Amino acid sequence: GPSFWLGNETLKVPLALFALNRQRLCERLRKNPAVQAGSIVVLQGGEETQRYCTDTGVLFRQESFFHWAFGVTEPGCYGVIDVDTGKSTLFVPRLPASHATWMGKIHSKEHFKEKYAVDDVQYVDEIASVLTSQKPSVLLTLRGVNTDSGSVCREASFDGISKFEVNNTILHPEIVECRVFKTDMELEVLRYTNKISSEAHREVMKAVKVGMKEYELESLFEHYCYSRGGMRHSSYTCICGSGENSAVLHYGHAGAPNDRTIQNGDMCLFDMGGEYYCFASDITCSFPANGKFTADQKAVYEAVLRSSRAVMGAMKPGVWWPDMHRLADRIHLEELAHMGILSGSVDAMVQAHLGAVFMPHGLGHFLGIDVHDVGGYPEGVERIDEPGLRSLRTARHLQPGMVLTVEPGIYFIDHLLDEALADPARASFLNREVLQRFRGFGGVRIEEDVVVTDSGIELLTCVPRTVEEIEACMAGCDKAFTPF
Amino acid sequence: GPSFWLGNETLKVPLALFALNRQRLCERLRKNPAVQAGSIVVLQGGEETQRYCTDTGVLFRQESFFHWAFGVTEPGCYGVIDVDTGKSTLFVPRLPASHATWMGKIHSKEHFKEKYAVDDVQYVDEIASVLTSQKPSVLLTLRGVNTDSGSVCREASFDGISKFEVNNTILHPEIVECRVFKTDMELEVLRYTNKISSEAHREVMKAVKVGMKEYELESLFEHYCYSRGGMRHSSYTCICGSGENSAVLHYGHAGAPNDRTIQNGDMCLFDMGGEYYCFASDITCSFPANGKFTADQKAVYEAVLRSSRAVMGAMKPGVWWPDMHRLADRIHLEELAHMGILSGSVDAMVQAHLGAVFMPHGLGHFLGIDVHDVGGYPEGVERIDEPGLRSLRTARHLQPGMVLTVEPGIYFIDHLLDEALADPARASFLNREVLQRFRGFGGVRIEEDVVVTDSGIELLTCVPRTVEEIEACMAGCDKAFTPF
Ligand code: PRO
Ligand code: PRO
Ligand SMILES: [Mg+2]
Ligand SMILES: [Mg+2]
Ligand SMILES: [Mg+2]
Ligand SMILES: [Mg+2]
Ligand code: NA
Ligand SMILES: [O-]
Ligand SMILES: [O-]
Structure with a gap:
């Protein structure tokens, strides 16, 4: 036909x-x-x-x-x-x-x-x-x-x-x-949107130079997606956050329009996804602007890589999505304690909802024809009224055919940190002298798109993810995509 | 400030x-x-x-x-x-x-x-x-x-x-x-939007290859405008009409979305303009897809170039804009007769409104914060109820500070041609033995943005316009042209 x-x-x-x-x-x-x-x-x-x-x-x-x-x-x-x-x-x-x-x-x-x-x-x-x-x-x-x-x-x-x-x-x-529940034909389209958007993310990582404006990479991403992928639309406005802007979750809108100059030492957090024939993709890559992770950057980044892969490794039918969010919180807290930003019992940190200070948004969401796809809270499925979890866009259990983003992050957000430091139930976990060094760091988010299968998941996204992979990608010489 | x-x-x-x-x-x-x-x-x-x-x-x-x-x-x-x-x-x-x-x-x-x-x-x-x-x-x-x-x-x-x-x-x-009436500060912005969009049109002419999809050039244009010009928006949806599509005046919308493969022998008509800080530009370049005008393509193209330059040369304060539209009509009819497409008295062709068969739209319009800018028909200014002229977006007299597009074109639009051939008042002017050759040609539009000044006009647009200039640009030649 x-x-x-x-x-x-x-x-x-x-x-x-x-x-x-x-x-x-x-x-x-x-x-x-x-x-x-x-x-x-x-x-x-x-x-x-x-x-x-x-x-x-x-x-x-x-x-x-x-x-x-x-x-x-x-x-x-x-x-x-x-x-x-x-x-x-x-x-x-x-x-x-x-x-x-x-x-x-x-x-x-x-x-x-x-x-x-x-x-x-x-x-x-x-x-x-x-x-x-x-x-x-x-x-x-x-x-x-x-x-x-x-x-x-x-x-x-x-x-x-x-x-x-x-x-x-x-x-x-x-x-x-x-x-x-996506049909196999719909899944073919979402594999494609992830393929083109993954390629475009790689071109952006190869193209980033200190001194560029954030929007130059937005432009390049959308040009790759349209000219090579036929994606006339993006799935959502591109988020191209450099430096402290990487702590702003939906950066890039008209009020904050990707207009900062990328500086040496910045982290970049680029959340972009092309749309093909009204089917979404939604991918976030985080990386150092200058192509080399500092020790502090590596530590934060690898903390989120750990939660990313722990959640993906746990996902399968019957898993309750809020439990995955809590798993990510616990891993972040463990890693931030290893770094010296936190001290004390991680069990107690979890009880005090300290995870939500560093990840105030939901772990991930249904994706399909809309980037925040429908059906996260059907009748009988309730929103959990706790920090972090209340921002989850679904509290459902996983079933085969569901398509989800998996997007843990760690951010250093001044008003959330200041609230925590004022609260005696949370302040005792926070080592101010170490945390002070991370003020203005921005944040890291690693976002994959996945399909729930009978036994686990299928990963749709294909971008560099380890520190070594990312540094190799950014140092690559390939003139595989050169506009004028 | x-x-x-x-x-x-x-x-x-x-x-x-x-x-x-x-x-x-x-x-x-x-x-x-x-x-x-x-x-x-x-x-x-x-x-x-x-x-x-x-x-x-x-x-x-x-x-x-x-x-x-x-x-x-x-x-x-x-x-x-x-x-x-x-x-x-x-x-x-x-x-x-x-x-x-x-x-x-x-x-x-x-x-x-x-x-x-x-x-x-x-x-x-x-x-x-x-x-x-x-x-x-x-x-x-x-x-x-x-x-x-x-x-x-x-x-x-x-x-x-x-x-x-x-x-x-x-x-x-x-x-x-x-x-x-544009201030000098506003004119500075319109000079800039014309500069960037002109540069982007030149990059597009250099990049076009037979076998490309029209939207590949839309994408490239918008990428130049955003990454080099800071233009996040276009002033209107890009019109990238190749072959027969160049006869479709607002081609490129969702129903006809720039999705044709460009063929050897096609004419291209690309009407595109970036927007900077909500100020418009609106430029149309016409050129052969393969970089070499045929004799038929040169003849139609130079007819529109003649009317373009005649209008720009005649524009000054006090001129009635409908008179410029009629001037372009008369020149198009003269040149179509010089090509052998038409025969007979051009005076009689004009009396029969034959010009509107080949240019069914208005000669040009006010441009500013909107591409079709406000104020064309203030109270007391009436729309002229004749073919072609009724599509004029203003019937005002020119005054210093007005910004107008000058966009004559000639198109071969089957239902308009066939209407003329069925009309005894129009049919005898058309020579089918020659016209048949131009069926499916599409069309040519040459669109400049200009400011009315005390002495005439200031041309804002800066793109190659003669056949020689266009062929040189398409062959890759740097500023091988001299604007009007
Ligand atoms: O809105 C959301 O749910 C996610 C959070 C980070 C950006 N997109
Ligand atoms: O709409 C208008 O008035 C002109 C005609 C050709 C394209 N833009
Ligand atoms: Mg995202
Ligand atoms: Mg998302
Ligand atoms: Mg135009
Ligand atoms: Mg116009
Ligand atoms: Na590089
Ligand atoms: O996201
Ligand atoms: O136009």
């Missing part, structure tokens, strides 16, 4: 991927005792947008649930699925003649049927009429709460929908649960 | 630029009979957004009127200006402590006052109190219609604004009129 492809060495993604997702969704809905025979799933695609009140178009990127179900790149579409038969119908805009002048060929409905391998294609202005002629019992629409943003999913609507029986509660948990 | 700067060789933009815009706006309002003493201009900045219902942040780019007045890069701000004194107050978000962990340093109000060189800084939640203390007569807010998008500008609002007298009609046409 047909495939999405951007030519050259980019990945061919079969449209069968999306057909399988539609089938899986129907199979799950059919087993839900509340779903009536004759139900039709109705999803609304994203629409084109502009900057504010201007005519400056924003590059269109499809809404994630719609993409998961249909793989459609064009704005202004709807898509429906007959639950009982699995039959799919795509609705596309009926375009004006002048589209041919300004925007390009006015493709036929048959072109879109062939392109997307759906059962039928109709025009958007006929959706009420087409759905009426199918005599559905109920329209199943999308509405629920994203547990990372707190936003409510936008429910499909169209002129005449008021004439139908509509249910907006059943679908969201079911399509979310389907998205949590 | 302070400047915006992204280091390296990027442009230092004085914050005095925005202070002058505020002063100019106040001076204009003071002369306006509808404006009373004690008025305060109130603008609301853009807010951070995310993709649909996800927590995937969209990179924040400031709203254009707010940027013009304040130059503020952070989301969530408001800004007010006392009309009688010119005193400026910036309102910034009061951030949660956790911002320090995730987003970066929580800057003081004094930091922002120094950064932006405003008279006062306050937190956004205090805006009702602060304005109440000033006992304004009326708040002047922004509401009007953008004449390119048809959108209504977003008027500022805040909790408690209902307690004030608010006028939302006075400000819009006045701040639009200020934006139409």
Whole structure:
């Protein structure tokens, strides 16, 4: 069948991927005792947008649930699925003649049927009429709460929908649960996004020089991903934190826009991942700007390498993700004590939540069509109200087919350190005279993307990770990627 | 005073630029009979957004009127200006402590006052109190219609604004009129955006090879602009049209995403422009993919070069922009006749609006903080209801300080050609025996950015333009060209 492809060495993604997702969704809905025979799933695609009140178009990127179900790149579409038969119908805009002048060929409905391998294609202005002629019992629409943003999913609507029986509660948990478990076809795309992003991270490590601005590496990363990988989008805004900025977790946004000069002696923490056909990657590499770890840098870095590999080595079905977070906390505390930053009983440190002073974020999260993917906190799964753990984006147990980031880190964050030093329950563990040397260090994060398998995990990411590997990579002479 | 700067060789933009815009706006309002003493201009900045219902942040780019007045890069701000004194107050978000962990340093109000060189800084939640203390007569807010998008500008609002007298009609046409006329400080930025984008177009012409995907050059262009120019954004989505795609005026959007393989014998039409600190550039270069113009390609290209230079040579204060559009039309028809594509009386061709078959868009538009800049159709200035001219984005007379694109083109667009051939009023001018050869040619557009001056124009763009210059650049030749 047909495939999405951007030519050259980019990945061919079969449209069968999306057909399988539609089938899986129907199979799950059919087993839900509340779903009536004759139900039709109705999803609304994203629409084109502009900057504010201007005519400056924003590059269109499809809404994630719609993409998961249909793989459609064009704005202004709807898509429906007959639950009982699995039959799919795509609705596309009926375009004006002048589209041919300004925007390009006015493709036929048959072109879109062939392109997307759906059962039928109709025009958007006929959706009420087409759905009426199918005599559905109920329209199943999308509405629920994203547990990372707190936003409510936008429910499909169209002129005449008021004439139908509509249910907006059943679908969201079911399509979310389907998205949590990646098919082998989806895993092929995530292997690819990790491959290109890994290559781009290596090019960045080879290119970094003292004196460069952080954003020069952002630019290079995105150029590699687009020109070589066909990744027009990144999965999230690139985080290119040098020096003390490596302690800022989502550095790089408009308010802190990757605009620091990299200096000799800095650590770099680069968290970047290209997106291909709306599938994510999310990789973080940490390394010395000048290509040689100092003793202090090596110690912090290898502490995080230890937790990274201990967590990956422990992951397998049935493992409770909060236990992995706590494992990483304990290892960090052990290593920081070995370094002399901490003293005392690590058991007592753990009881006082000291780990969260150094790693205030979650160990990792589901990844898929969104970088912070859906389904981390379905009904019955509660957020743990403790330092560190409360920032976990899931408290689920691991099962095969889940895709997770594994991203421990250690940071030296002044307001968290100052709080701890003021608290007698934590201050006694902290050796101020040693810690003072690490003020302004920034931080280290090592982020891998992995798939849970029947027996353990599959690592998708492939970047240098030991101190020796990293130093060798940065010292490499290869003119394998040289823009102008 | 302070400047915006992204280091390296990027442009230092004085914050005095925005202070002058505020002063100019106040001076204009003071002369306006509808404006009373004690008025305060109130603008609301853009807010951070995310993709649909996800927590995937969209990179924040400031709203254009707010940027013009304040130059503020952070989301969530408001800004007010006392009309009688010119005193400026910036309102910034009061951030949660956790911002320090995730987003970066929580800057003081004094930091922002120094950064932006405003008279006062306050937190956004205090805006009702602060304005109440000033006992304004009326708040002047922004509401009007953008004449390119048809959108209504977003008027500022805040909790408690209902307690004030608010006028939302006075400000819009006045701040639009200020934006139409660029200050010398603004011209410095537009010179720079044209310098970087011109350099990037030259790198693209050097790098293009038969067999590449169009998006490879989009990627390279944006990489040059960001890494060398500090341009994180483009001014609009890159149009990288090869072969037949060069006849599609806004090619490159999600529905036609620069995904064609460039073939031997193709023409390329690349319309790309980096944005620096929310100031636009907009440049189009046309050239043969294989670096050598054929006779047919040279003839079409030099026709557009002739109209480009005729218009630039005729532009000066007092010229009616629709007359320049008609001048380009007449030249295109003359040259198409000289090529044998058309025959008969050119006067008669013009009377039949035949020019619009080959150039269905406007000759050019205002450019500034938006690529299609504001103020083309103020009250009293009417759109001309004729082919081609109705697509003009302004029908004003030229005045010093205006910045316009000059972008004639000739395209071979099948549905427009076929319409003409079906029309007895137009059909006899076309020679099918020659025209058939140009079916699928695509098109040529030559786009310069210029400033209207007292004596004529200042050309901002600096790219190769003659056939000889273009062939030399594509063959790798350093500054082998002399601009107009
Ligand atoms: O937001 C999150 O969960 C992770 C933490 C570090 C950056 N991304
Ligand atoms: O939209 C416009 O007015 C011009 C026409 C060609 C591309 N940009
Ligand atoms: Mg990350
Ligand atoms: Mg992550
Ligand atoms: Mg243009
Ligand atoms: Mg233009
Ligand atoms: Na190197
Ligand atoms: O991350
Ligand atoms: O343009």
